[PDB]
Design a protein around this nucleic acid. Sequence first.
DNA 1: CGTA
Lengths: 257, 255
Amino acid sequence: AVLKIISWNVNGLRAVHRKGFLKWFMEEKPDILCLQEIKAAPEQLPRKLRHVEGYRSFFTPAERKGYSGVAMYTKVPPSSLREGFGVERFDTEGRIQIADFDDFLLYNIYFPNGKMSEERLKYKLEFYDAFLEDVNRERDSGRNVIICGDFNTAHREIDLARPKENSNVSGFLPVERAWIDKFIENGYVDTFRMFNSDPGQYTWWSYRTRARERNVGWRLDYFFVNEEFKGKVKRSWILSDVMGSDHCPIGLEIELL
Amino acid sequence: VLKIISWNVNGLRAVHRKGFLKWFMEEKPDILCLQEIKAAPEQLPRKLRHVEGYRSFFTPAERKGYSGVAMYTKVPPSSLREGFGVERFDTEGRIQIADFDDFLLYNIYFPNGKMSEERLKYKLEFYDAFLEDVNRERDSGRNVIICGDFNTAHREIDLARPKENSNVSGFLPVERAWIDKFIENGYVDTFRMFNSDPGQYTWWSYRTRARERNVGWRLDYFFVNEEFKGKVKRSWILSDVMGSDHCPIGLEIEL
DNA sequence: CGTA
Ligand SMILES: [Mg+2]
Ligand SMILES: [Mg+2]
């Protein structure tokens, strides 16, 4: 019947761990948990963090130490786990997990931040290209798909507090926002906007200006589903009172047979 | 050529676990000035109080494990004063005023205002009491060296993140203006008369590689009265010494 | 991400 999925950029898993991540996790009780920015060598993580009771866990670390990484905890045996799009440039930064849960594929993606370089804005845009290709291929083969994670782009003006101030800042460039339009036009739905059309709804806030108190944030974290599957979506929400990282978690609930 | 070193040590027992004792003989100043001793000096090692070649002087706070200043000297002063004659300022282990005849040395751990409005207010009034003190000594004709942790970076050049910190104590317009007012009473920031570059810092946050990335503040200073500035040979930041969140700073004077 |  009901399956709950949570996505969370954790800005460091052992950092969030010292702040009581496990207490939060055991309280929230997702059936599947997607995490971005683990940043730790998974094989030397606390055992109580790798083996949480009732879950199987999967870590996909970057090649660079202390950088990126994603993880998934699941109560549902996956029938398959893939950790890349099959393009080495993109598959080495610890950004990709694709799990087969029979009814749907689950993509847990840490999409690149394009602020550091002109070439990281390029890397980002090309990761975007490669992701759309991958998901489209799986979808066109008859698979339902759920994509969650940190897209690193606010879509519409509704999705950041200062839209006009950032129109030349990565995360809100016309190029970036245009790809999300294109992504959607390929048959995918922004699930939060299926149920909530309000401004103010953010998932990231700068640590400075102490922006979170002020609610001066960006919606950088999304659950997307393919159109064909959108009737199984019952809930899509932001867990805005969950602290510990510069991102808050997002939740999805699907009703399934 | 007399060399003075000023170092906020974030605890004298914590830094003792690094070979501060080995640094201190591996780098032998005429006068060593230490801020934030954080310890009952009678429960400090015999070898930590009584160093060979040095008379040591500890000015501890009333509060346990808090604040405190120390001075190690080859030539002992003729007097040591430990307060401005203002009670709430004189009980926090913040003040050493040593008469070396040829000059007075102020070894001051200035309050930090970051924790509350009351402590910011306290830091600012401490700023006033000190200025009155040093103005009075300077007016009696004395040559004055003032060293230690001011807990304020004066100008944007003196910290890595001026913009996000302009509402943080350590970089308020009220704190920066007092450094203006102090200098304009006829006192000289010694470092800035030899080095005018950015990225010159004495403190770095422990949190987030800060030092290894050089995100720091210049919070430690050597100041002299205007008249006396002619005798300052060198003023430098000992950027590479470790074991505290502050690094040492150095002064070489001629006579 | 470094200001605690
Ligand atoms: Mg991050
Ligand atoms: Mg300290």
